[PDB]
């Protein structure tokens, strides 16, 4: 396989893992081409690989995968028809050609939404046409998420299969399945957004900013590891994110294996918990190490007060290699705080920095910087107090009513954002409450950071494409440490011009009674926002009193025969009282 990289990779990867990545890849570059067309390209390329395994001497096996992929893209007939100047790439050398192709990938393709089929239909297809069933999904998921790291999407497509295995052969397949599909969807939609943010935050902020976030996260993960070790990994980890964001998966995947290789050797130098993962095969090893549990910190926890306070060379050591010192601070503090959000640990370091800038210029440095660890406690409480205020509320209200609290809350704060956005974001923010309040107190803040980050990012992408607010924009275009407290610090818009009434917005029909919870709930939540938009000035009590009356209205007309007249004639009456109530 010296001659042929193809064969080299068709052996490092399964045929099954290969065929899927080739499919993923082609979708990701050629988003508009049909499935049938692609599975044709897949098989042409697969048959070609095998040939090279047998004889690496076979013609066109010697070629680099870069050259072979491009050659196979330019094979496509509708390349000039559908993809225009993407076809012009095909006239260039393979350095410029591949880079050309990457530049034409649509960050947001305009493809219809994927409408989930009824379980019965799906399960039938899972049985009768499994491969076809499972490959379209990778296709549909990939066309829509072109920059998504193909190997991650390979792990997602197999957890998918395990749900049809489990939920299809069950009494109630629907009630079983759709919460596992919405679950994976949610985990997959998160992972997509996490990859954008990671790549975005590398360019929109410093490599320093990324290296710092990295120090802190890896110091929690591997607490029993020297600054020098941690430091080295931060470097290699940056190298890999900088490359994977360039977009070349081949080098990206290679670097990862190499890094994982380094990690799996030297494992006693890094962490205990890396054994499981380190056994795993190529693509998976890297995947697992990213997710490995935070290793236990050494029993001996030397006071960080001794080194960074209550010492003389604090200001000396800082003067030379301050970013080593700051880094050393952050490392030391990070491993002694795996329950802290990373955006917090960084905030603390920007403090220690900010402090030592002032206090080293000071006449008495020792007495100047003696209360730095007291400047951290307000910063630890703010995110902790919002964790408890919010998880308190959640338990009382349950997920739906929690969501509805958030809807009313945010609609007043930013009434300009479309009802659909507000509804999605609030729903999703509910799931953060569900996901993370089930985590114990320690583990709560990391959890929040992960999910908020994506929810907040997705929001911050959507909005900026179609801006409606100054205050959302300031927060999105702001530091990663300061992005969340910026949103938290939002207040109600007192300048809003209440929306006009429209009865159809508050009309309702019998369907709702038998509808699915999700789609029923969303119907009601649209109304809630629309209500709050139309009457922002209204009290909790006032809105509750309506919500109580709307509730009973449904409970009634869904226990009615000829519900349709009920809904119309009680909806006329409900609407009228409501206007009276809030008018
Ligand atoms: C509104 C979502 C409900 C779930 C709990 C949210 C709590 C927000 C505060 C915690 C933020 C942690 C990240 C950070 O340290 O900035
Ligand atoms: C347009 C949607 C705005 C969503 C705001 C997300 C805020 C995330 C942090 C939660 C902090 C508590 C709620 C708040 O007061 O903002
Ligand atoms: C003032 C204009 C007419 C308003 C009509 C009532 C709309 C309220 C719908 C809110 C949904 C409540 C949530 C629920 O009960 O699950
Ligand atoms: Co060979
Ligand atoms: Co190899
Ligand atoms: Co059968
Ligand atoms: Co998506
Ligand atoms: Co390359
Ligand atoms: Co390289
Ligand atoms: Co002292
Ligand atoms: Co967790
Ligand atoms: Co303003």
Supply the CATH number for residue 210's domain: 1.10.246.10
User: Residues 493-497: contacts with CB within 8 Å, 24+ apart?
Assistant: 493/412, 493/413, 493/414, 493/415, 493/416, 493/536, 496/415, 496/416, 496/536
Residue 30 lies in a domain: yes
The answer to whether the CB of 445 is under 6 A from ligand 1 is: yes
> Could you list the residue range(s) of the whole structural domain that residue 285 is in?
203-291
Is residue 578, in this structure, part of any structural domain at all?
no
Domain check: are 355 and 403 in the same one?
A: no
Q: In the numeric block, which tokens belong to residue 386? A: 């919002």
Whether 398 and 447 share a structural domain: yes
Residue 197, token pair as written in the block: 């943010």
Scanning 204-309, the segments in alpha helix (DSSP H) are 207-221, 227-244, 249-264, 267-270, 275-279, 282-291, 304-308
By most ligand atoms within 8 Å of CB, the mutation choice from 385, 390, 410 for ligand 2 is 410
Query: Is residue 525 in some structural domain?
Result: no
Residue 42 in domain: yes
CA quadruple 367, 369, 371, 373: dihedral sign = negative
**Atom 2, ligand 1: which residue's CA is nearest?**
429
Residue 523 within any structural domain of the chain: no
Looking at the chain, the residues that come just before a C–N gap of over 2.5 A are none
Asked whether 48 and 6 are in contact (CB, 8 A), the reply is yes
Contact 191, 451 (CB under 8 A): no
The three-class DSSP label of residue 258 is helix
Q: Which residue shows structure tokens 């010697």?
A: 62
Q: What is the resolution of this structure in A?
A: 3.3
Residues 87 and 168 occupy one common structural domain: no
Q: Which of 462, 489, 516 is a domain's end point?
A: 489
State the total domains in the chain: 5
Provide the b/e sequence for 255-281 (b: ≥16 CB within 10 Å).
bbeebbeebbeeeeebbebbeebbeee
In a domain, 543, yes or no: no
Residue from 414, 490, 491, 532 to probe ligand 2 pocket by mutation (most atoms less than 8 Å from CB)? 490
> Annotated binding site: which residue ranges?
2, 5, 12, 66, 239, 243, 246, 248, 251, 254, 258
Residue 145 sits in the same domain as residue 187: yes
Collapse the DSSP code of 310 into the 3-class scheme (helix H, G, I; strand E, B; otherwise coil) and give the result: coil
Q: Which of 174, 200, 226 is the last residue of a domain?
A: 200
427-449 in b/e burial notation, b at 16+ Cβ within 10 A? bbbbbbbeebbeeeeeebbbbbb
Q: How far is the CA of 477 from the centre of ligand 7 (A)?
A: 22
Same domain (yes/no): 80, 30: yes
Same domain, yes or no: 368 and 421: no
Q: What angle do CA 68, 61, 74 make, to 5 degrees?
A: 20
C-alpha dihedral (12, 15, 19, 25), degrees to nearest 10: 0
Residues 215 and 195 in one domain: no
CA of 36 to the centre of ligand 6 (A): 25
The structure tokens listed for 364 are: 């008495």
3-state secondary structure of 281: coil
Give the largest CA-CA distance in the chain: 84
Burial class (CB in 10 A: 0-12, 13-18, 19+), 284: middle
Which of 265, 291, 317 terminates a domain? The answer is 291
568, part of any domain: no
- CB count within 10 Å of CB 226 equals 12
Q: Rounded to an integer, what distance in angstroms lies between the CA atom of residue 216 and that of residue 167?
A: 40
What does the alpha-carbon distance between residue 484 and residue 487 come to, in Å, rounded to a whole number?
5
Q: Report how far ligand 12's centroid is from the alpha carbon of 471 (Å).
A: 7
Query: Do 194 and 222 fall within a single domain?
Result: no
Distance of alpha carbon 571 from alpha carbon 522, whole angstroms:
18
90 and 66 belong to one structural domain: yes
Protein residue whose Cα sits closest to atom 6 of ligand 1: 387
Residue closest by Cα to atom 11 of ligand 2: 488
Q: What approach was used to elucidate this structure?
A: X-ray
The set of residues, in sequence order, having a beta carbon less than 8 Å from that of 334 and lying 6+ positions away, is 215, 216, 217, 219, 220, 340, 345
Ligand 2, atom 15, residue with closest C-alpha: 488
Could you give the C-alpha distances from 322 to 225, 346, 391, in angstroms and in order?
Answer: 20, 15, 39
Which residues have a beta carbon within 5 Å of ligand 8, which is an ion?
Answer: 248, 250-251
Tell me the C-alpha distance between 292 and 309, whole Å. Answer: 33
Q: Is 21 in contact with 151 (CB distance < 8 Å)?
A: yes
Ligand nearest to the CA of 9: 5
**35 with 67, same domain?**
yes
Question: Which token pair is 46?
Answer: 């697969």
In a domain, 508, yes or no: no
Residues 392, 360, single domain; the answer is: no
Q: Is residue 26 located within the same domain as residue 100? A: yes
Whether residue 382 contacts residue 485, with contact meaning beta carbons closer than 8 Å, is answered with yes
Please report, to the nearest 10 degrees, the dihedral formed by the alpha carbons of residues 207, 208, 209, 211 taken in order.
Answer: 80
């Amino acid at each position: 396989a010296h001659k042929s990289e193809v064969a080299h990779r068709f052996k490092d990867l399964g045929e099954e893992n290969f065929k899927a990545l080739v499919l993923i890849a082609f979708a990701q570059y050629l988003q508009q081409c049909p499935f049938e067309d692609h599975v044709k390209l897949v098989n042409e390329v697969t048959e070609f690989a095998k040939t090279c395994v047998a004889d690496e001497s076979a013609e066109n096996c010697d070629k680099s995968l870069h050259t072979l992929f491009g050659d196979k893209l330019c094979t496509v007939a509708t390349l000039r028809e559908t993809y225009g100047e993407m076809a012009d790439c095909c006239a260039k050398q393979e350095p410029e050609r591949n880079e050309c192709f990457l530049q034409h990938k649509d960050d947001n393709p305009n493809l219809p939404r994927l409408v989930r089929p009824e379980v019965d239909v799906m399960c039938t297809a899972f049985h009768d046409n499994e491969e076809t069933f499972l490959k379209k999904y990778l296709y549909e998921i990939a066309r829509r998420h072109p920059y998504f790291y193909a190997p991650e999407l390979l792990f997602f497509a197999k957890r998918y299969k395990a749900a049809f295995t489990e939920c299809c052969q069950a009494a109630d397949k629907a009630a079983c399945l759709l919460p596992k599909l919405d679950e994976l969807r949610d985990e997959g939609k998160a992972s997509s957004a996490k990859q954008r943010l990671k790549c975005a935050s590398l360019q929109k902020f410093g490599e320093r900013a990324f290296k710092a976030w990295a120090v802190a996260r890896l110091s929690q993960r591997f607490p029993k590891a020297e600054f020098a070790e941690v430091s080295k990994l931060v470097t290699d980890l940056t190298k890999v994110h900088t490359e994977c964001c360039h977009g070349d998966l081949l080098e990206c995947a290679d670097d990862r294996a190499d890094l994982a290789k380094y990690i799996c050797e030297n494992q006693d130098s890094i962490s205990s918990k890396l054994k499981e993962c380190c056994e795993k095969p190529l693509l998976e090893k890297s995947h697992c190490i990213a997710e490995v549990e935070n290793d236990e910190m050494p029993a001996d926890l030397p006071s960080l007060a001794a080194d960074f306070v209550e010492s003389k060379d604090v200001c000396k050591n800082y003067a030379e290699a301050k970013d080593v010192f700051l880094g050393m601070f952050l490392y030391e503090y990070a491993r002694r705080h795996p329950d802290y959000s990373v955006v917090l640990l960084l905030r603390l370091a920007k403090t220690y920095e900010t402090t030592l800038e002032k206090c080293c210029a000071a006449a008495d440095p020792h007495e100047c910087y003696a209360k730095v660890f007291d400047e951290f406690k307000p910063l630890v409480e703010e995110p902790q107090n919002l964790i408890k205020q919010n998880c308190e509320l959640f338990e009382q209200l349950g997920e739906y009513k929690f969501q509805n609290a958030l809807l009313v809350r945010y609609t007043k704060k930013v009434p300009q954002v479309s009802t659909p956005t507000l509804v999605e974001v609030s729903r999703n923010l509910g799931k953060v409450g569900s996901k993370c309040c089930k985590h114990p107190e320690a583990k709560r803040m990391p959890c929040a950071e992960d999910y908020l980050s994506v929810v907040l990012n997705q929001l911050c992408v959507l909005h900026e494409k179609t801006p409606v607010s100054d205050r959302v924009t300031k927060c999105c275009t702001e530091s990663l440490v300061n992005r969340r407290p910026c949103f938290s610090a939002l207040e109600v818009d007192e300048t809003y011009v209440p929306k006009e009434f429209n009865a159809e917005t508050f009309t309702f029909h019998a369907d709702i009674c038998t509808l699915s919870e999700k789609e029923r709930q969303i119907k009601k939540q649209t109304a809630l926002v629309e209500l709050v938009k139309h009457k922002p000035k209204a009290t909790k009590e006032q809105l509750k009193a309506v919500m109580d009356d709307f509730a009973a209205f449904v409970e009634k007309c869904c226990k009615a025969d000829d519900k349709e007249t009920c809904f119309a004639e009680e909806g006329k009456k409900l609407v009228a009282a409501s206007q009276a109530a809030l008018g």
